[PDB]
Amino acid sequence: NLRAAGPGWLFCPADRPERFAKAAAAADVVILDLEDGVAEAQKPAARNALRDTPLDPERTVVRINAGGTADQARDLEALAGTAYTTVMLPKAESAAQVIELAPRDVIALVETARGAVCAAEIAAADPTVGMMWGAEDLIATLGGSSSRRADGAYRDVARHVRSTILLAASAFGRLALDAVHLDILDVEGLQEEARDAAAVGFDVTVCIHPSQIPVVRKAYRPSQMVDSPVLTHAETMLR
Amino acid sequence: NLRAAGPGWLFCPADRPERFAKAAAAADVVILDLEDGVAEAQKPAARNALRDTPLDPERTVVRINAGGTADQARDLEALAGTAYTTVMLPKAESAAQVIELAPRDVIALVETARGAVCAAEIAAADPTVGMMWGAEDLIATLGGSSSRRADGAYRDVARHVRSTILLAASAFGRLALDAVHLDILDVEGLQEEARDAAAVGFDVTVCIHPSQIPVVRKAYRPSQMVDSPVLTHAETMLR
Amino acid sequence: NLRAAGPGWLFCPADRPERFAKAAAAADVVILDLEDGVAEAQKPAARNALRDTPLDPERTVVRINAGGTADQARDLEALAGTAYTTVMLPKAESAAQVIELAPRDVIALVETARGAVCAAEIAAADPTVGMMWGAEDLIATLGGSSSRRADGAYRDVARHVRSTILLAASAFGRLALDAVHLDILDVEGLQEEARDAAAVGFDVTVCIHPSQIPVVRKAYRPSQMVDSPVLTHAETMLR
Ligand SMILES: [Mg+2]
Ligand SMILES: [Mg+2]
Ligand SMILES: [Mg+2]
């Protein structure tokens, strides 16, 4: 029941088992990371820590490696010796990549052009329980050099994919996860970004540092003709 | 021939037959509303006023209730005793929801994530003559709390759906209707918004108060290499 | 090998063979234009100049007329007496319009609502090697009057199509070409626009005047948690 946890999710590299307990205490949900947070040479060690140092599987997701990679095959073998049931799929690009992870629950991380183009098909796949987007791999794989303008605001193609993922998730009753704020010390920018995300109906802001969790939890709390939806807005604020 | 009427369309709750004549005098097209403008307990009375107090069916659309609801079934029964041929479908989410309203003409009001994801299929359905988007139900159904930033500008997912509906409508030769400006006294904001909508090729700005109609009509009137399209822009301004 | 040429592409009307040599010297790739750059009465003469005054076919694309037009049929006849292998298809609106140009390579120019709605299908068609978008025909065909706000920034539906084309191109490994800056003397605006385009991974900025080429080439050269994609950003900047 991931929708019952709060909006602050925290990545934690899985080759750092000494930090698992602190990550769990700081965040609503921990994403133990076998992908880009762990160096290729450290991924075997991270798979052992995954088995050796368990966290609450009701509050923990495992980010595996991308479809078709040898690393993902090793990840799923390691996961068999765990109680984790929900995985995050990076570079998610087709419904078939989600379906081959059945019977696990899948959070699809769309961070390439093909995943954006196919977001609705990815969201609709039966194992999907959530959609995330990743600004940095998105820009990297498009061939660009930055996800943000000088003032920290997302560039337009990033805004486009962000909206795409929010709509695709909501169309199929999935959780919607907003992209990470890489500038850890930029609390002001994270504050505005998470408030923006909460305002349009994102369920989660994913973080890469535990200091970001209090900012996210606070942002997801609120500070002319009135129709029925505007009353729903007011009710959403109270909840 | 709704494309021949001006750009100022006005919602009027159908349980207010005393206001029908004033709505018709104020607006280019009246949308008699059986959905969110009328309280659930008042919808039977509104269906009687629909039959009892007719407006010009060439300049009047009836907003019915959403597909699958008992209310929509009662609405279509009431409409059989009228000369209205065009209905507005709220929470429009599939081509099938449009097709089941044949042989009526349908303006699909997309105001949910699923309708945005399926906008092209909805626009392409044979009964469709127009696409509208609804910012407030959109944000409400996504789980968010406001469609606009502090300065009154739409949030990004709203801008995304607005463009989606304009493109889907135009791709299939349909009318494009822009969302309502709920802040009635915010004439400055409506002025900018309707000018923006007219500039990109929206056909209609829908209003919720008759004072908004003169602002919309005025906004839809106009105040380096030149290629063939730039001359079309100039010709569009003159027309 | 169009990806090996630089980012500065230049339209040159094909009824101006006296300017072909200067266009080739100024630009990375020349788009010899049989469509909107040439008046209808001048198109036969332009087809003769196409045969009579050749440019390097490895650095030259021919913009033909739109699918289904008598002009496109005459264009393809003229092209048979040339060594050009790559054409640009204006008002590109379906995969079928691309496929009927086989065995030529095709740069699809999306500049209508239907082409935006079908961009992924157009990009995926086997002859496609590139996607471009055209702001001015886009707004013209939507029924609007300007692609840009007062400050020169694109209106939202233009930003939407721009992102659509970048994502559709990148999803299928195609070149991504950004729209032309019609205000030739607005060097500052072109500078910002091409920098923006290069930053998100556009491959080409198309120009309509040779003075714009140096601005584009310079713009496509570059002036907190670090993950693998941010290192790819840094590597992209160095390249
Ligand atoms: Mg990533
Ligand atoms: Mg509504
Ligand atoms: Mg054009």
Residue numbers in the entry:
A (entry chain A), B (entry chain A), C (entry chain A): 2 to 224, 250 to 265
Tell me what the authors wrote about this structure, in their words:
Rv2498c catalyzed the carbon–carbon bond cleavage of (S)-citramalyl-CoA to form pyruvate and Ac-CoA (kcat/Km = 2.3 × 105).
Mtb protein Rv2498c is currently annotated as the β-subunit (CitE) of the heterotrimeric prokaryotic citrate lyase complex involved in TCA cycle cataplerosis. Combining phylogenetic analysis, in vitro enzymatic assays, in vivo Mtb experiments, and X-ray crystallography, we identified Mtb Rv2498c as an essential stereospecific bifunctional β-hydroxyacyl-CoA lyase (β-HAC lyase) that carries out the last step of itaconate dissimilation pathway and confers resistance to itaconate. A systematic evaluation of substrate specificity revealed (R)-HMG-CoA ∼ (S)-citramalyl-CoA >>> (S)-malyl-CoA ∼ β-methylmalyl-CoA as substrates for Rv2498c. To investigate the molecular basis of Rv2498c substrate stereospecificity for the carbon–carbon bond, we determined the structures of Rv2498c in a variety of liganded states by X-ray crystallography.
